[PDB]
Write an enzyme that holds these catalytic residues in place. Structure first.
Site, PDB file in Angstrom:
ATOM      1  N   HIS A  33       0.782  -1.233   0.000  1.00 20.79           N
ATOM      2  CA  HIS A  33       0.000   0.000   0.000  1.00 20.79           C
ATOM      3  C   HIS A  33       0.815   1.285   0.000  1.00 20.79           C
ATOM      4  O   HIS A  33       0.286   2.327  -0.335  1.00 20.79           O
ATOM      5  CB  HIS A  33      -1.001   0.020   1.174  1.00 20.79           C
ATOM      6  CG  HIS A  33      -0.429   0.515   2.471  1.00 20.79           C
ATOM      7  ND1 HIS A  33      -0.118  -0.321   3.523  1.00 20.79           N
ATOM      8  CD2 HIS A  33      -0.133   1.769   2.891  1.00 20.79           C
ATOM      9  CE1 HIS A  33       0.344   0.395   4.533  1.00 20.79           C
ATOM     10  NE2 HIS A  33       0.348   1.667   4.175  1.00 20.79           N
TER      11      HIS A  33
ATOM     12  N   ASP B 116      -0.531  -7.053   1.562  1.00 22.23           N
ATOM     13  CA  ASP B 116       0.143  -5.776   1.744  1.00 22.23           C
ATOM     14  C   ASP B 116       1.629  -6.004   1.952  1.00 22.23           C
ATOM     15  O   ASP B 116       2.112  -5.988   3.084  1.00 22.23           O
ATOM     16  CB  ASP B 116      -0.450  -5.066   2.958  1.00 22.23           C
ATOM     17  CG  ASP B 116       0.055  -3.658   3.113  1.00 22.23           C
ATOM     18  OD1 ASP B 116       0.761  -3.172   2.199  1.00 22.23           O
ATOM     19  OD2 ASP B 116      -0.266  -3.033   4.150  1.00 22.23           O
TER      20      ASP B 116
ATOM     21  N   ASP C 152       1.345   0.909  20.000  1.00 25.41           N
ATOM     22  CA  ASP C 152       1.108   0.272  18.704  1.00 25.41           C
ATOM     23  C   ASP C 152       1.897   1.033  17.638  1.00 25.41           C
ATOM     24  O   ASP C 152       2.406   2.118  17.912  1.00 25.41           O
ATOM     25  CB  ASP C 152      -0.399   0.343  18.389  1.00 25.41           C
ATOM     26  CG  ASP C 152      -0.738  -0.041  16.946  1.00 25.41           C
ATOM     27  OD1 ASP C 152      -1.836   0.336  16.487  1.00 25.41           O
ATOM     28  OD2 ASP C 152       0.067  -0.721  16.274  1.00 25.41           O
TER      29      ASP C 152
ATOM     30  N   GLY D 281       3.163   6.449   9.725  1.00 25.61           N
ATOM     31  CA  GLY D 281       4.364   6.489   8.912  1.00 25.61           C
ATOM     32  C   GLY D 281       5.194   5.228   8.994  1.00 25.61           C
ATOM     33  O   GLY D 281       6.265   5.154   8.395  1.00 25.61           O
TER      34      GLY D 281
ATOM     35  N   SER E  20       4.171   1.951   8.102  1.00 22.36           N
ATOM     36  CA  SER E  20       3.967   0.925   7.098  1.00 22.36           C
ATOM     37  C   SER E  20       5.250   0.501   6.415  1.00 22.36           C
ATOM     38  O   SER E  20       6.105   1.318   6.101  1.00 22.36           O
ATOM     39  CB  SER E  20       2.988   1.410   6.053  1.00 22.36           C
ATOM     40  OG  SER E  20       1.710   1.471   6.633  1.00 22.36           O
ATOM     41  N   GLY E  21       5.381  -0.796   6.192  1.00 25.89           N
ATOM     42  CA  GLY E  21       6.564  -1.303   5.531  1.00 25.89           C
ATOM     43  C   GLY E  21       7.656  -1.639   6.511  1.00 25.89           C
ATOM     44  O   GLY E  21       8.639  -2.263   6.136  1.00 25.89           O
TER      45      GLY E  21
HETATM   46  C1  0Z6 Z   1       0.802   2.865   4.933  1.00 30.17           C
HETATM   47  C2  0Z6 Z   1       1.150   2.687   6.421  1.00 30.17           C
HETATM   48  O1  0Z6 Z   1       1.942   3.569   6.736  1.00 30.17           O
HETATM   49  C3  0Z6 Z   1       0.015   2.771   7.435  1.00 30.17           C
HETATM   50  C4  0Z6 Z   1       0.404   2.064   8.740  1.00 30.17           C
HETATM   51  C5  0Z6 Z   1      -0.622   2.210   9.848  1.00 30.17           C
HETATM   52  C6  0Z6 Z   1      -0.380   1.247  11.006  1.00 30.17           C
HETATM   53  N1  0Z6 Z   1      -1.369   1.484  12.058  1.00 30.17           N
HETATM   54  C7  0Z6 Z   1      -1.657   0.640  13.047  1.00 30.17           C
HETATM   55  N2  0Z6 Z   1      -2.567   0.974  13.957  1.00 30.17           N
HETATM   56  N3  0Z6 Z   1      -1.033  -0.529  13.132  1.00 30.17           N
HETATM   57  N4  0Z6 Z   1      -1.200   2.178   6.917  1.00 30.17           N
HETATM   58  C8  0Z6 Z   1      -2.192   2.945   6.506  1.00 30.17           C
HETATM   59  O2  0Z6 Z   1      -2.128   4.171   6.529  1.00 30.17           O
HETATM   60  C9  0Z6 Z   1      -3.432   2.234   5.994  1.00 30.17           C
HETATM   61  C10 0Z6 Z   1      -3.496   2.336   4.464  1.00 30.17           C
HETATM   62  C11 0Z6 Z   1      -4.540   1.455   3.840  1.00 30.17           C
HETATM   63  C12 0Z6 Z   1      -4.241   0.144   3.493  1.00 30.17           C
HETATM   64  C13 0Z6 Z   1      -5.223  -0.693   2.972  1.00 30.17           C
HETATM   65  C14 0Z6 Z   1      -6.520  -0.216   2.795  1.00 30.17           C
HETATM   66  C15 0Z6 Z   1      -6.828   1.093   3.135  1.00 30.17           C
HETATM   67  C16 0Z6 Z   1      -5.839   1.921   3.652  1.00 30.17           C
HETATM   68  N5  0Z6 Z   1      -4.583   2.891   6.594  1.00 30.17           N
HETATM   69  C17 0Z6 Z   1      -4.967   2.630   7.839  1.00 30.17           C
HETATM   70  O3  0Z6 Z   1      -4.402   1.812   8.558  1.00 30.17           O
HETATM   71  C18 0Z6 Z   1      -6.172   3.408   8.337  1.00 30.17           C
HETATM   72  N6  0Z6 Z   1      -6.446   3.190   9.779  1.00 30.17           N
HETATM   73  C19 0Z6 Z   1      -7.391   3.041   7.497  1.00 30.17           C
HETATM   74  C20 0Z6 Z   1      -8.000   1.716   7.845  1.00 30.17           C
HETATM   75  C21 0Z6 Z   1      -7.876   0.628   6.982  1.00 30.17           C
HETATM   76  C22 0Z6 Z   1      -8.485  -0.600   7.281  1.00 30.17           C
HETATM   77  C23 0Z6 Z   1      -9.225  -0.740   8.460  1.00 30.17           C
HETATM   78  C24 0Z6 Z   1      -9.351   0.338   9.330  1.00 30.17           C
HETATM   79  C25 0Z6 Z   1      -8.738   1.558   9.018  1.00 30.17           C
END
Ligand code: 0Z6
Ligand code: NAG
Ligand code: GLC
Ligand code: FUL
Ligand code: CA
Lengths: 254, 95, 210
Positions: free
Chosen positions: A41, A90, A186, A190, A192-193
Site C-alpha cells: 500500500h 500488503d 502500537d 508512517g 507501514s513497511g
Molecule cells: C501505509 C502505512 O503507513 C500505514 C500504517 C498504519 C499502522 N497502524 C496501526 N494501527 N497498526 N497504513 C495505513 O495508513 C493504511 C493504508 C490502507 C491500506 C489498505 C486499505 C486502506 C488503507 N490505513 C490505515 O491503517 C487506516 N487506519 C485506514 C484503515 C484501513 C483498514 C481498516 C481500518 C482503518
C-alpha cells in the site's frame, strides 16, 4: 510508533527509510544488500518512480551523521493479488539500483524458513516493530527511529478481543495481530513497511510488516501485521528471478 | 486405597488419594502415570527440535538441524555460527 | 468447533492437587488429535502432549517451575490425517483454558495424621508434611516448604460415643487439645489456606482414634 522508545542508533540496522522527492513515504526492511521489503500500500500513489529513495544507516532525520547510505529504488514489486486500496496482500519487494554497504549500522534481517516462522517464531510472545511514523494518531512523526516491543495473538483471539467494527476488514491468513487493545502502544501511519522482527536464540527474523489498524493504539483494537511467512517462497523466487523492464512489477502469487 | 494396581509407570512413586491417586515422577518422566518419556519427543514442532535455527523432522530417524543462509552448523549438531562478517539478524554494536 | 471435520476442544478444566496439574477436556477424539500449548501472560508458548488422542494433558513440569505465576493454556485440534491443517485464518483450531495460578488454586490433598502421642492430660495430634510435585532443584517440596506460613490446619474430634463436634487449629504442624483422663478421642484433620479465595479448605484426613 505509539508508546515506543527511541531505537538506540545501531540497534535497528535493518530499518530502511523510504523517501520520495525528499518526503517520508514509509519504512522498509533490509533482507539483503539490494533487497528491501516494504508494505504494498505504500505505493498506491507514487507518481515519480524515479525520486523513490531508500535510506539505510538512517537514525536521526534531524542531524546528518555519516552512517546513512542512499539508493535509488530500482524496482518495486508487489503481489499479483494485491488490490491497491485494500488490506490484503500488503507487501512489497524493493530492489536498489546499487547494493548498500554492510557495516555496524547496516545489516540485513533474516528471512526465516517458512516452517521455522510457523512452528517456532509464531509462538515467541514478543517482537519489535519500528519506524519514524506517527507518535500518536494525527500527531507528529518521529525524528529519531522509534521501536516498540509488542505481543502477538492468533487470529481467533484477535477477533474475540477487538471491538467489532462496521466493516473491519477480515483478518485473513496473510496478516496477524500484535499489540495491545488498551490504548497503550502500537505502530502507526508512517510505519507501514516497517519490520516486525522476532528474536529467537540470538538471531532476529522478519515475521511481520506494518500494514494497517483502526487508528493508532485505539482501545479495543490491535494492529494488523502482514504475516511475512505466507510470502517466503514468493520473496526468494523474485530475489533469484532476473530483472524485469518496468519499475512497478506485479509478480504473481502464489 | 488406589495405588494398588501401581498405575505410576517408569519407576514413579504413588501417593494416592481417596477415590484417586497421584504419581510422583522421575525427572525424565511426566504424566498422570509418569507414562510420558520426556525423551521420545525430539520433533521440530516440540521446541524447535532443539535446534538454534532451522529444523527438519525425518521419517524413522533423528530430526536434523540446519543453519541460515550465512551460518554454519557447529559440531554439536544443533548450533549455528556466523561464517561471515555481518550475518543477518545480528546486531553488530551489541555483539 | 467451527467444524466440518475438525472439532474444537471445549470445557478445558484444570485438575490440580498438590501441584500435580493436569489439564482435561472434551471431546473424546474422533478422527482428530490434540496438542496442548501452555504459556505465561508474557512468556513464549511451550507445546506439550503432541498429537495425542487424549482428553487430558499433564502440565506439572511447567507449572511448578513457578507456581506463583498465572498460566494460560490452550488445546489445538488437527484431523488425524495431517497434524498440520490450515484452519481459515491459516492457523490451527484451538481453545483457551481458564487462567491458572498453582499457588492459589491447586487443592491441598487429603492430609494424613503423621504421628500423634500423649504428653499427659492432653493429646498431641500430628500431621504428615505432605509431599508436593513442586520439584525444586532435583528434590520435592512439602506443603510447609511451599506455602510456608500460609498453611494452617483444623482438628475435628469426637470422643468415646461422643456427643458434640469439637475443632482446634494451629499454624504450626502440631495440634494440642486438652482431653480429660479417659474417654478415647478421635482426630479428623484437614489442611487449610485461610488467605485463599477458592480451595481454602481440603478434605478431612482419615480418622485416627485410640
Ligand atoms: C501505509 C502505512 O503507513 C500505514 C500504517 C498504519 C499502522 N497502524 C496501526 N494501527 N497498526 N497504513 C495505513 O495508513 C493504511 C493504508 C490502507 C491500506 C489498505 C486499505 C486502506 C488503507 N490505513 C490505515 O491503517 C487506516 N487506519 C485506514 C484503515 C484501513 C483498514 C481498516 C481500518 C482503518
Ligand atoms: C471476509 O470474511 C468472510 C467470512 O468468512 C468471507 O466469507 C469473505 O470471503 C471474506 N472476504 C470478504 C468478502 O470481505
Ligand atoms: C489400578 O489403579 C486404579 C484402579 O482404580 C486405576 O486408576 C489404574 O488404571 C489401575 O492400574
Ligand atoms: C517416589 O519415591 C521413591 C519411591 C523413589 O523411587 C522415587 O523415584 C519415586 O518417584
Ligand atoms: Ca541521519
Amino acid at each position: 510508533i505509539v508508546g515506543g522508545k527511541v531505537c538506540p542508533k545501531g540497534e535497528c540496522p535493518w530499518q530502511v527509510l523510504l523517501l520520495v522527492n525528499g518526503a517520508q513515504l514509509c519504512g522498509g526492511t533490509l533482507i539483503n544488500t539490494i533487497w528491501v521489503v516494504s508494505a504494498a500500500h505504500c505505493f498506491d500513489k507514487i507518481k515519480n518512480w524515479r525520486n523513490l529513495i531508500a535510506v539505510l544507516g538512517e537514525h536521526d532525520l534531524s542531524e546528518h551523521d555519516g552512517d546513512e547510505q542512499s539508493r535509488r529504488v530500482a524496482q518495486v514489486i508487489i503481489p499479483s493479488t494485491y488490490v491497491p486500496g485494500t488490506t490484503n496482500h500488503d507487501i512489497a519487494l524493493l530492489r536498489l539500483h546499487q547494493p548498500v554497504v554492510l557495516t555496524d549500522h547496516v545489516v540485513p534481517l533474516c528471512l526465516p524458513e517458512r516452517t521455522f516462522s510457523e512452528r517456532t517464531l509464531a509462538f515467541v510472545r514478543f517482537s519489535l516493530v519500528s519506524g519514524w511514523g506517527q507518535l500518536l494518531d494525527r500527531g507528529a512523526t518521529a525524528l529519531e527511529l522509534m521501536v516498540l516491543n509488542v505481543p502477538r495473538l492468533m487470529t481467533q483471539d484477535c477477533l474475540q478481543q477487538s471491538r467489532k467494527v462496521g466493516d473491519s476488514p477480515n483478518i485473513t491468513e496473510y496478516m496477524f495481530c500484535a499489540g495491545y487493545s488498551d490504548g497503550s502502544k502500537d505502530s502507526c501511519k508512517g510505519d507501514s513497511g516497517g519490520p516486525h522482527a522476532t528474536h529467537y536464540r540470538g538471531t532476529w527474523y522478519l515475521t511481520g510488516i506494518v500494514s494497517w489498524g483502526q487508528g493508532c493504539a485505539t482501545v479495543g483494537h490491535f494492529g494488523v501485521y502482514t504475516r511475512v511467512s505466507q510470502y517466503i517462497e514468493w520473496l526468494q523466487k523474485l530475489m533469484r528471478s532476473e530483472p524485469r523492464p518496468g519499475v512497478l512489477l506485479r509478480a504473481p502469487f502464489p | 486405597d488406589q495405588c494398588a494396581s501401581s498405575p505410576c509407570q517408569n519407576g514413579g512413586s504413588c501417593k494416592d488419594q481417596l477415590q484417586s491417586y497421584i504419581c510422583f515422577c522421575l525427572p525424565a518422566f511426566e504424566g498422570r502415570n509418569c507414562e510420558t518419556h520426556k525423551d521420545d519427543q525430539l520433533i521440530c514442532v516440540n521446541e524447535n527440535g532443539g535446534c538454534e535455527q532451522y529444523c527438519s523432522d525425518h521419517t524413522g530417524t533423528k530430526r536434523s538441524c540446519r543453519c541460515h543462509e550465512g551460518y554454519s552448523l557447529l559440531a554439536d549438531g544443533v548450533s549455528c555460527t556466523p561464517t561471515v562478517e555481518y550475518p543477518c539478524g545480528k546486531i553488530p554494536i551489541l555483539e | 468447533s467451527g467444524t466440518t471435520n475438525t472439532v474444537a476442544a471445549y470445557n478445558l478444566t484444570w485438575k490440580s492437587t498438590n501441584f500435580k496439574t493436569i489439564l482435561e477436556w472434551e471431546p473424546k477424539p474422533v478422527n482428530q488429535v490434540y496438542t496442548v500449548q501452555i504459556s505465561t501472560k508474557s512468556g513464549d508458548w511451550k507445546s506439550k502432549c503432541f498429537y495425542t488422542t487424549d482428553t487430558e494433558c499433564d502440565l506439572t513440569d511447567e507449572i511448578v517451575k513457578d507456581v506463583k505465576q498465572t498460566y494460560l493454556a490452550r488445546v489445538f485440534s488437527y484431523p488425524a490425517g495431517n497434524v498440520e491443517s490450515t484452519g481459515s485464518a491459516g492457523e490451527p483450531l484451538y481453545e483457551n483454558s481458564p487462567e491458572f495460578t498453582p499457588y492459589l488454586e491447586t487443592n491441598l490433598g487429603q492430609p494424613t495424621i503423621q504421628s500423634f502421642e500423649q504428653v499427659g492430660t492432653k493429646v498431641n495430634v500430628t500431621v504428615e508434611d505432605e509431599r508436593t510435585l513442586v520439584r525444586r532443584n532435583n528434590t520435592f517440596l512439602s506443603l510447609r516448604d511451599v506455602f510456608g506460613k500460609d498453611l494452617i490446619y483444623t482438628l475435628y474430634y469426637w470422643k468415646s460415643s461422643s456427643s458434640g463436634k469439637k475443632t482446634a487449629k494451629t499454624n504450626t504442624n502440631e495440634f494440642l487439645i486438652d482431653v480429660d483422663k479417659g474417654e478415647n478421642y478421635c482426630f479428623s484433620v484437614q489442611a487449610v489456606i485461610p488467605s485463599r479465595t477458592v480451595n481454602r479448605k481440603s478434605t478431612d484426613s482419615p480418622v485416627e482414634c485410640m
